[PDB]
Amino acid sequence: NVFYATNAFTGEALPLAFPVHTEVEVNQAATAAAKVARDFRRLNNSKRASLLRTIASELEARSDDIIARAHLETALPEVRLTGEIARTANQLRLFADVVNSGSYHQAILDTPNPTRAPLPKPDIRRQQIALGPVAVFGASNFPLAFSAAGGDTASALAAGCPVIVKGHTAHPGTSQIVAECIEQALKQEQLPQAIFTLLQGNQRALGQALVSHPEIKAVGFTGSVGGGRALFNLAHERPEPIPFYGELGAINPTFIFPSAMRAKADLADQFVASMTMGCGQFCTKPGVVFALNTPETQAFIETAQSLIRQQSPSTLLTPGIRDSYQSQVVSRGSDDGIDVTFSQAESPCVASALFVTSSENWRKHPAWEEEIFGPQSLIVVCENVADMLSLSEMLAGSLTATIHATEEDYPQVSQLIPRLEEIAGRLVFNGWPTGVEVGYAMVHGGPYPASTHSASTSVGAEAIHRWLRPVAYQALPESLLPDSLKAENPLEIARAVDGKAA
Amino acid sequence: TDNVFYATNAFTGEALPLAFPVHTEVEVNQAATAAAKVARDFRRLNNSKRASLLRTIASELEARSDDIIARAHLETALPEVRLTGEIARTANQLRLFADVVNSGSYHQAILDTPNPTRAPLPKPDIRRQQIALGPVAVFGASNFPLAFSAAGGDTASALAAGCPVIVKGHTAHPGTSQIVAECIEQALKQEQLPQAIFTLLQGNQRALGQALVSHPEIKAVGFTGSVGGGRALFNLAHERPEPIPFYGELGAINPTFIFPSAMRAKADLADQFVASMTMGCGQFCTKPGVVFALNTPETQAFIETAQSLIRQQSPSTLLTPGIRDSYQSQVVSRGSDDGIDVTFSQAESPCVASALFVTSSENWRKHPAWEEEIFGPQSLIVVCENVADMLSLSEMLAGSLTATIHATEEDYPQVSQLIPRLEEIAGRLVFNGWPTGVEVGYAMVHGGPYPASTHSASTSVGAEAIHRWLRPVAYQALPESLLPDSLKAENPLEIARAVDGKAA
Ligand SMILES: NC(=O)c1ccc[n+]([C@@H]2O[C@H](COP(=O)([O-])OP(=O)(O)OC[C@H]3O[C@@H](n4cnc5c(N)ncnc54)[C@H](OP(=O)(O)O)[C@@H]3O)[C@@H](O)[C@H]2O)c1
Ligand SMILES: NC(=O)c1ccc[n+]([C@@H]2O[C@H](COP(=O)([O-])OP(=O)(O)OC[C@H]3O[C@@H](n4cnc5c(N)ncnc54)[C@H](OP(=O)(O)O)[C@@H]3O)[C@@H](O)[C@H]2O)c1
């Protein structure tokens, strides 16, 4: 059995057939991955770092092919795709630096004390090592940076874990080219092909078997709350439960104070640009804005409403995503106590939408907190700041939380931050949540449903730690200790001794 | 409460004085609600203040040491000499986390230096730190009524992280937990902090623990106990509308590999083995439950020496009637199997006999039910055909807290093939020593692959245990005045911070 990718612009099948893999290929892939797991995590840091950089170069070399195919499969602009390939490549290079530095080892040493009474203090040293093969499900809205060679794959390979990707049916051709790049990189580095494997197929039994395979030791997922939670449950029902890192969705609450409105005349313009970026197909898209019932807000709303009406027709990633959006916006727009403004569009294109309501009705409709993936957003007009702070106390988990204010509001903002810290992974001040910097301090995730594991990040240097577990070595002789823990520190890595700074 | 219950005298099986309440979902809700109410203030306290609280709890514990020891002894049958040492362990454990919190290292401050003139788009100012998850539920261990219970490692590390704690008191030692709770109550009063920071719930109705694990205000769980109950509670924790981290240590048999040269080098190795497996009457989670050795004369002698020592062991009194009944029932069943020899010490119920089983790697491969742990003064020796056989066996070992190797330089070539295999199944590897002792320091890893732990990427003992109760938050473009002290440009707390990848 085979299947074809769908032309995002026409809804018709694109050339090139892809295989429909099943539990048979899963078993084969997982078995081979397990077979090379030990050697892969034992490679010199410099070697695995080299592999990551080689993958980055190979990807750049096929940029032409990737962009051309991804554009037809997703309808994302070639310029957006060109920027994403660069993000993807530099992301891989970041982890190459991380691995090379040996920081991920997190070497910790307890200085022994043989003359301690009653009992002597033993020599104990610990480091982090790879969990084993990792299964990765890529994101449909970021076919490159969050997919086949995305953040989850890059950080897992960096940690020393073989990777098996369940290719997203929304962009099989894109993933195939990326897989060919990784295949080339492994050949040049002269490393086992089983280090990375791409599986394809439009039958869900595939993903379920992968998540349930006993040789799979962790999962990386980016997608819907429905499918994500289903797979998460599968992962924890296994004879041996495994970590499941899934980003399921968020509404990214934004709080705008009057003074911020007075300070930036184009704030409404910025808002619309943020919510319509990539036709609103960003997980960090500001889905709800809380503002006060003042003239500034009423003007903000009218400006935003006017821009929305003016907005051009949008083509979503797939006809399927197109359908869910249309039915949900028309459906919500008919709910109690909600005003909606639509742009002009005819299927297969969708219209952008801006909903407006009061905090009274927001409290009455908890379903409005659920994300509607597409170029739509909601504005909630609050009675006063107390009303606004009250609302923040009940917010569900989110990737981000944004605040627009000036010094005049700091007294109230100082009370709001502690509440937002509890529900979001990243707080943004006087800016928009859309952009996600791939650096060292990033936290892309947060409380459920933003992530199934709030104590982690799927983007940034710290993402590597999701695929590692510690091992303590007690009283082992120097010759038997891994290089990272040898007394002389031959790798010259950062290590923490008796609590001192590493 | 509608009902009360009594603790059981570990030596007589009769009820001890003092009745304890049987809490239900009602007290769970009250406790969790109150804990949630003080969670924010608790995590925002100055590091020095929360550090002081931990030290005050340690002092209060020491002040009631005589009462704790006297009660714990009757409730558990553990020697007072052992309990006196555990109180010190408990107190110094709290002081360790006091040092951790005070140092501000747990914040794990990380900063990305901004670059406003970067093209196409500028690089924003991003800073991140770890903050408390919120209220934490703790289930204490029956075999370590002090260091792994009410004021044990999970409670200590959680309070250190800034999380309120609700302990579901173990029914095996309610009186011990009560005294410990009174100590924490005193410490909170002295520090002038909310009582809701710590709450002890008691009761012998399982509905209690299940309601606690499922309460929406509870944000994480610490558990030390059986795989049956532990896995059940773990599943509950992940079926919640909002799944929460569950850190449970469920069991292990701590595989030990002994090479011929090691037995030659230490004539008393068998003696050491027996001492390790019978320590605390074998009621250690790190007890060496299975020893793999080669089919050589040294091994036969080792076995005969161990067997002789086992025959002379003093009758043992276990922790609870259930652990007792479970031990007796399980050792007799296994001994009746074919292909396995068992040696018992002399004992009459309720006391139990120590036991040493012996079998071949073939029969071990034929009876997978033998890898199942049996909590008590019992252990198994598996005689292997050769080193290759030994290595083949290590490849199929279940997760364990520890893995031990006894060898000399002679064996290093084979030991180097074995370590990589053991790294994959154990949280801590011990060389030429025994797994029983667990050093409370900075490098410890007490846990490991399932079932040793439900979250292999963590430790329940050691300074790093604090990270189980924390989650990161990134702050982007916030002004200095709105940022937490740990992330302020001037670093007013003078804590270790990592900038642009540099070493903290
Ligand atoms: N918050 C985040 O970080 C974020 C960002 C990006 C993506 N997502 C979300 O993803 C949604 C866009 O739809 P999507 O197509 O990317 O999501 P999706 O339907 O959840 O699909 C994601 C992947 O999981 C697979 N899958 C889903 N449920 C599964 C199950 N129960 N059994 C087996 N496989 C399963 C899909 O297989 P098929 O290939 O068969 O569909 C696909 O490969 C939006 O809501 C977007 O916000 C989350
Ligand atoms: N790996 C380590 O770090 C470590 C250290 C020490 C102890 N342990 C393990 O602890 C075990 C000792 O057995 P145990 O009898 O003390 O353990 P247990 O039966 O698992 O009980 C532990 C606690 O969990 C509660 N509990 C268990 N089942 C529950 C359920 N399904 N619903 C609600 N509450 C539940 C018990 O309540 P009741 O009080 O009502 O029974 C008790 O307070 C041994 O297997 C030992 O290896 C592990």
Curated annotation (Swiss-Prot), chain B:
Q: Could you list this entry's UniProt keywords, alphabetically sorted.
A: NADP, Oxidoreductase
Please give the superkingdom of this protein's source. Answer: Bacteria
Q: State where NADP(+) binds.
A: G225, S226, V227, G228, G229, G230
Q: List the disulfide bonds.
A: none
Tell me which residues this entry annotates as catalytic.
E249, C285
Report the InterPro entries cross-referenced here: Ald_DH/histidinol_DH, Ald_DH_C, Ald_DH_N, Aldehyde_DH_dom, Aldehyde_DH_Superfamily, ALDH_KGSADH
What is the enzyme's main class? oxidoreductase
Stated EC number for the protein is: 1.2.1.4
GO MF terms listed in the record are: aldehyde dehydrogenase (NADP+) activity
| Reactions the enzyme catalyzes | an aldehyde + NADP(+) + H2O = a carboxylate + NADPH + 2 H(+)
| Functional summary from the UniProt entry | Catalyzes the oxidation of long-chain aliphatic aldehydes to acids. May be implicated in controlling luminescence as it catalyzes the oxidation of the fatty aldehyde substrate for the light-emitting reaction.
Per the record, the similarity remark reads: Belongs to the aldehyde dehydrogenase family.
Assembly description: Homodimer.
Q: What name has this protein been given in UniProt?
A: NADP-dependent fatty aldehyde dehydrogenase
Highest classification ranks of the organism: Bacteria, Pseudomonadati, Pseudomonadota, Gammaproteobacteria, Vibrionales
